[PDB]
């Protein structure tokens, strides 16, 4: 005969007081199973008595950790002390129903006057908690803040990530998405620089003729203003751009003096210089991405970084998808990702897969294994030079 | 009778606050 029963849920645990308990002898009957199924014949069995939510997601994580380990938590002991009538089993006990037998034993050793019944051992409390877990979305809804799906989602992620220690050594998503950003804005930079190159050489073609390096082009067009305001070594700029006094500045000024491009309007020059500022901002952000990505590559997978080099190694990582896929791939599938070229290519694929599995299955990887492998590659390079 | 909340004793004291409150109420 049951009196109260605990029920631990994701948002928190609640204890119900049973009224008009179920028959334990005819428990395998279609009528009592139908009554357990429907809701209008189970709310007569179960009446809600006490609820306790978690205070914070860290506290709920602590709840799952202690409960799955079997040890009751202190605030669960507090809530049971609040709800159960105070007694020791000298003359009158209280029957509780819980799911885990170890939790039953611990609650019994905490409160002497509470005899627990385990869902593992007693079919009546088994069927009772089964009905409650089935209709759990309706019984709590009068005080259920929100719904239960998102809480179960987040609580399961918190518990499993705490058991795995996942975010300490998962960073491959940052690596691959950085690579995709890098080559995306590299293409965008190339296209925008070509655009401003044509779009300003319409006004001044000798600058196109004499200055390559479209980033330096964007810099010098942000610098030059209009075709009519030229002096060679004005302030702080051309000597750190390029050679200053005797190589290019006089050439540019002379090309402007002989130049026959169209005059440009003020607002058109403003728009051109805004586009050039845009291009140089993306180029500066590119070099920032490259530096931070080299450092992150050295932190994540250093053996690949020293064998292949960061750009192509991260291309391989990006194409495989993650370090786990890269390591799970054998050598020849990694090859899919004369005769000397084929020989050194298969050899390099083998050493690449070795570096991948090392740098993935370490916790915090090291560098000297990749240094030893690169030394072996250089020695095979000398071996093929012997030919 | 779980009708109301009965006052605490040393048997049913959970936290350090309740322990010290009962210590002071004993030493008074």
């Amino acid at each position: 005969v049951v009196n109260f029963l605990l029920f631990e849920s994701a948002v928190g645990f609640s204890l119900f007081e049973v009224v008009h308990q179920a028959d334990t002898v005819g428990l395998e009957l279609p009528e009592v199973k139908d009554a357990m199924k429907t809701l209008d014949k189970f709310g007569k069995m179960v009446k809600l008595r006490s609820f306790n939510p978690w205070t914070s997601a860290a506290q709920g994580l602590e709840a799952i950790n202690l409960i799955s380990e079997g040890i009751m938590p202190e605030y669960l002991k507090s809530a049971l002390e609040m709800n159960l009538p105070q007694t020791s089993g000298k003359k009158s006990k209280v029957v509780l129903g819980v799911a885990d037998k170890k939790l039953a034993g611990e609650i019994t050793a905490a409160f002497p006057g509470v005899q627990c019944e385990a869902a593992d051992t007693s079919e009546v409390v088994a069927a009772l908690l089964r009905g409650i877990r089935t209709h759990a979305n309706k019984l709590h809804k009068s005080l259920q803040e929100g719904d239960i799906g998102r809480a179960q989602l987040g609580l399961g992620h918190a518990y499993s990530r705490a058991k795995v220690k996942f975010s300490v050594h998962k960073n491959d998503n940052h690596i691959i998405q950085g690579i995709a950003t890098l080559d995306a804005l590299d293409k965008s930079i190339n296209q925008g620089a070509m655009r401003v190159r044509e779009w300003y050489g319409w006004h001044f073609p000798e600058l196109i003729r004499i200055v390559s390096d479209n980033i330096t082009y964007a810099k010098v067009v942000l610098a030059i203003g209009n075709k009519s305001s030229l002096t060679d070594e004005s302030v702080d700029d051309l000597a750190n751009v390029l050679n200053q006094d005797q190589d290019k500045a006089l050439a540019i000024i002379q090309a402007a003096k002989v130049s026959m491009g169209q005059d440009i309007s003020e607002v058109d020059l403003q728009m051109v210089r805004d586009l050039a500022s845009n291009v140089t901002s993306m180029a500066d952000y590119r070099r920032i991405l490259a530096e931070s990505l080299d450092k992150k590559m050295s932190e994540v997978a250093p053996n690949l970084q020293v064998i292949l080099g960061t750009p192509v190694a991260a291309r391989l990582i990006a194409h495989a998808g993650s370090l786990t896929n890269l390591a799970k791939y054998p050598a020849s599938t990694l090859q899919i990702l004369p005769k000397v070229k084929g020989r050194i290519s298969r050899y390099l694929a083998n050493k690449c897969s070795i570096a991948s599995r090392i740098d993935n299955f370490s916790e915090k990887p090291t560098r000297h294994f990749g240094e030893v492998l690169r030394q072996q590659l250089e020695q095979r390079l000398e071996w093929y030079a012997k030919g | 009778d779980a009708s109301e909340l009965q006052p605490i004793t040393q048997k049913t004291s959970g936290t350090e606050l309740e322990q010290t409150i009962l210590a002071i109420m004993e030493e008074s």
Binding site: E8, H157, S160, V164, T324 | -
Partner: protein, 242 residues
């Protein structure tokens, strides 16, 4: 074979949620992708230009016993889109990704795995897909994730343990609705490595009927996996839903 770039058409299969993609010289099985453009384990995916965000993923039957069963011709699979599925033995989440895509955004898929590194892969898959929740715990002790798992409608079992029937027995006794569908994948070489396969399947079906299900179907998925069998049963009823 089914080379990348061939044009196929996509028709809906008889089951609710699986599509069959037929085209050219090979017909294959696919599920609607939940997150577009990002393959999980390097599978082939089909793009459809609707008159973008819709794409299908090709289900490898040799690698997933559920896809093997559906090509083998199961009568039903009990997992309509929106029905909660408890998956036991969710190693690295390939078939679990497929089941999550079948169930869709309104349901949920409770992937229970045990090995920690397969758990890491499963954590990655569950960060990507928002309707699968992962649980890294030993499936023999459901008192661990009894706080996480609510009353699901389908139980998939892909464990090969000698205690397979008892494992699914306690997990269904704790987390399965009245008349609850389940599928189990039985590997004879692991259940009884001495015995013949038909006798092994008969023994396991009898152990399930002792553990209070009712078996409705059993097929030997022979052209995809040797000495296997997929057994479909219902928990504590004769019809599936109600």
């Amino acid at each position: 074979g089914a080379k990348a770039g061939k044009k196929v058409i996509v028709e809906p299969h008889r089951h609710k949620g699986v599509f069959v993609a037929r085209g050219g010289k090979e017909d294959l099985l696919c599920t609607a992708n939940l997150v577009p453009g990002e393959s999980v384990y390097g599978e082939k995916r089909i793009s459809v230009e609707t008159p973008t965000k819709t794409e299908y993923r090709i289900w490898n039957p040799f690698r997933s016993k559920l896809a093997a069963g559906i090509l083998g011709g199961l009568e039903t699979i009990y997992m309509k889109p929106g029905s909660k599925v408890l998956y036991l033995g969710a190693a690295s989440g390939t078939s679990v990704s497929h089941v999550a895509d079948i169930v869709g955004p309104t349901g949920a898929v409770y992937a229970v795995e045990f090995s920690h590194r397969s758990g890491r892969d499963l954590i990655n898959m569950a960060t990507r897909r928002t309707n699968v929740i992962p649980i890294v715990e030993d499936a023999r002790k459901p008192m661990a994730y009894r706080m996480l798992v609510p009353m699901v409608d389908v139980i998939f079992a892909d464990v090969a343990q000698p205690d397979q029937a008892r494992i699914v027995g306690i997990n269904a006794r704790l987390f399965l609705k009245q008349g609850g569908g389940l599928l189990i994948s039985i590997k004879a070489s692991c259940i009884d490595s001495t015995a013949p396969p038909e006798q092994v399947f008969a023994s396991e079906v009898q152990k399930l009927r002792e553990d209070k299900f009712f078996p409705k179907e059993q097929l030997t998925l022979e052209p995809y996996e040797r000495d296997h069998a997929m057994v479909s049963c219902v928990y504590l009823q004769k019809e599936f839903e109600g």
